[PDB]
Design an enzyme around this catalytic site. Sequence first.
Site, PDB file in Angstrom:
ATOM      1  N   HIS A   1       0.806  -1.220   0.000  1.00  0.00           N
ATOM      2  CA  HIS A   1       0.000   0.000   0.000  1.00  0.00           C
ATOM      3  C   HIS A   1       0.835   1.264   0.000  1.00  0.00           C
ATOM      4  O   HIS A   1       0.318   2.338  -0.321  1.00  0.00           O
ATOM      5  CB  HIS A   1      -0.904  -0.012   1.247  1.00  0.00           C
ATOM      6  CG  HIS A   1      -1.428   1.336   1.632  1.00  0.00           C
ATOM      7  ND1 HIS A   1      -2.602   1.848   1.122  1.00  0.00           N
ATOM      8  CD2 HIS A   1      -0.928   2.290   2.455  1.00  0.00           C
ATOM      9  CE1 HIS A   1      -2.810   3.053   1.627  1.00  0.00           C
ATOM     10  NE2 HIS A   1      -1.806   3.346   2.435  1.00  0.00           N
TER      11      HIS A   1
ATOM     12  N   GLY B   1      -0.714   5.471  10.729  1.00  0.00           N
ATOM     13  CA  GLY B   1       0.725   5.364  10.724  1.00  0.00           C
ATOM     14  C   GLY B   1       1.254   4.029  11.201  1.00  0.00           C
ATOM     15  O   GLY B   1       2.470   3.790  11.114  1.00  0.00           O
TER      16      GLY B   1
ATOM     17  N   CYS C   1       0.618   1.037   9.899  1.00  0.00           N
ATOM     18  CA  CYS C   1       0.807   0.037   8.855  1.00  0.00           C
ATOM     19  C   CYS C   1       2.232  -0.486   8.856  1.00  0.00           C
ATOM     20  O   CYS C   1       3.183   0.295   8.968  1.00  0.00           O
ATOM     21  CB  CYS C   1       0.533   0.641   7.474  1.00  0.00           C
ATOM     22  SG  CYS C   1      -1.180   0.967   7.093  1.00  0.00           S
TER      23      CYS C   1
HETATM   24  C1  4IJ Z   1      -1.275   0.114   5.433  1.00  0.00           C
HETATM   25  O1  4IJ Z   1      -0.388  -0.570   5.082  1.00  0.00           O
HETATM   26  C2  4IJ Z   1      -2.512  -0.067   4.559  1.00  0.00           C
HETATM   27  C3  4IJ Z   1      -2.574  -1.205   3.751  1.00  0.00           C
HETATM   28  C4  4IJ Z   1      -3.691  -1.433   2.938  1.00  0.00           C
HETATM   29  C5  4IJ Z   1      -4.745  -0.526   2.924  1.00  0.00           C
HETATM   30  C6  4IJ Z   1      -4.681   0.640   3.724  1.00  0.00           C
HETATM   31  C7  4IJ Z   1      -3.571   0.858   4.557  1.00  0.00           C
HETATM   32  C8  4IJ Z   1      -3.778   2.171   5.308  1.00  0.00           C
HETATM   33  C9  4IJ Z   1      -5.032   2.771   4.734  1.00  0.00           C
HETATM   34  N1  4IJ Z   1      -5.651   1.751   3.898  1.00  0.00           N
END
Ligand code: 4IJ
Lengths: 305, 305
Positions: free
Chosen positions: B41, B143, B145
């Site tokens: 992403h 943040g 992720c």
């Molecule tokens: C973070 O990695 C991530 C992956 C997939 C989809 C989304 C996100 C944050 C916002 N949407």
Amino acid sequence: SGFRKMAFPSGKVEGCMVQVTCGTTTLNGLWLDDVVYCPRHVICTSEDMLNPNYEDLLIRKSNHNFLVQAGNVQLRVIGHSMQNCVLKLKVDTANPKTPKYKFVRIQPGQTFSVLACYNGSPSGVYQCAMRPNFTIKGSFLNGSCGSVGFNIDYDCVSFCYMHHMELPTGVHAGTDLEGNFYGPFVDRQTAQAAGTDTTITVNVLAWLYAAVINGDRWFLNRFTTTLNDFNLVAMKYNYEPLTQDHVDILGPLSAQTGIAVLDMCASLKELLQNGMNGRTILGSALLEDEFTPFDVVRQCSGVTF
Amino acid sequence: SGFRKMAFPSGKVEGCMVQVTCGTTTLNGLWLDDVVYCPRHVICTSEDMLNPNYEDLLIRKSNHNFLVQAGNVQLRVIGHSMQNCVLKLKVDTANPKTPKYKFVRIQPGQTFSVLACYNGSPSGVYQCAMRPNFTIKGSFLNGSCGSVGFNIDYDCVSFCYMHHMELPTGVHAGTDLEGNFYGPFVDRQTAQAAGTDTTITVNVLAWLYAAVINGDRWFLNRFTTTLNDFNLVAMKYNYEPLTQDHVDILGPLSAQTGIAVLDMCASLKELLQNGMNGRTILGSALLEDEFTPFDVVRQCSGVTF
Ligand SMILES: *C(=O)c1cccc2c1CCN2
Ligand SMILES: *C(=O)c1cccc2c1CCN2
């Protein structure tokens, strides 16, 4: 979103844990710069549990009686001293992994992370509060003496607890890192027991604010209360009195949610008087009191280290 | 004694966390040897949330579009690849702090520690279970992720989760470290929602054994049940079916306490049918299902790493 009992990352403390052996007794020590800190109980034997005189026990020891192991590396003890209920072993090597640190003595109601260790090796990490009766509800087995509790601020580790013993009700007692017990406990075998405990009111209030931040609102109501009226109800339910200092500390969470502190107090009053009637708050069917206002802000706003 | 939601010490994972920036998006990555792993992403923009073709997005990037920071040290990306929903950035420096590690894809009902991070900096650690519906009940802000989940065995870190997104009910979805989502979720903006969840029966049973080990016995009774009869009641209360494999896995705890597994099942049946009538178990007014049998043994017998 979400709300978990969250500990501080433990790596800065893992790098300080060592094993200390004196005679037949082995427990954990904390290696900072060229000093290892551990419970003085390590110098006790099976002919001493009942009121030992630790000054006598210590005068009879020499540096070579202390075996300190950091991983597979033996550390040579070059000096030894006693401070209250902690031993300070000077070693010939400064810990290259020493973090920025300080020693703090915490107040009841404050929380900290515990790094449970065995034989100098960390086993797990969890969050504790110092109870109003100066015990903690830890998770410790034999061999856990010398495990430490800590908070992290920016890059600094604030050590606040060293584990010594388990009391008869299964809760835990220990010292600050200067060797002073929290509460009235002593490091000898006597009939000491935990005093009656109370619930940490300002923390329950913080957690209700956390729940609102996370979308749990069913417990709110239109009412307000006075501090005096609320404390009358607290006392009935064995809650700590709520002070104006507590109110001011909750200011940030009150401002973020738009719920006045005394309005949340009236919600808590209703919860104490009526229960939850089968509902939960943040996944709990009891009112949680081991999150401080600062814990809520850090987790519902995301500060790091 | 005591029983806490205990995470693994996080230090071996802290040393692997990095920040990854592509364009305007920054999230966390995992630096192992000379590779950084992060959610794909990161290559998305504000003209892409709705079904982006990641192969197209990636073909249009070059190594200099990826900024990887480990502390204050920028790492030079020398290659980039996509594997399922994860990006693999080859960097010019092997992480000197790489632990012994492996990647594992866990089953529902298994637990792991999460090291929540922001901008490459760890903020906290906590224990999660993979729910039967393949979500986790995490605690994550914007943040987060790329934060990872892991278990530690002896000296080996088994990475099992990388965080991607929050679903509408506030629970969390992510991937194994090979980029395959747990559950049916996809990394794009669609109407996906958590499926109905169920309670992890074998874990509840483990936790009842933990309570007995710690001296909570009020919920025991003289009765036994059959597997078939117990599962009829489980289904009624939306509990996972209990298999013979689960029974065998509980063998150790059954032997340590002298309580046959099917005897504990009859206690659980009574708890489901009658509630707790104001009592608690291990400090909880609900039946806890995020401790596996192995979690109980490790904490009620004290293994370290
Ligand atoms: C973070 O990695 C991530 C992956 C997939 C989809 C989304 C996100 C944050 C916002 N949407
Ligand atoms: C461990 O450090 C310790 C300190 C004080 C008293 C006791 C113990 C373990 C057993 N009793």
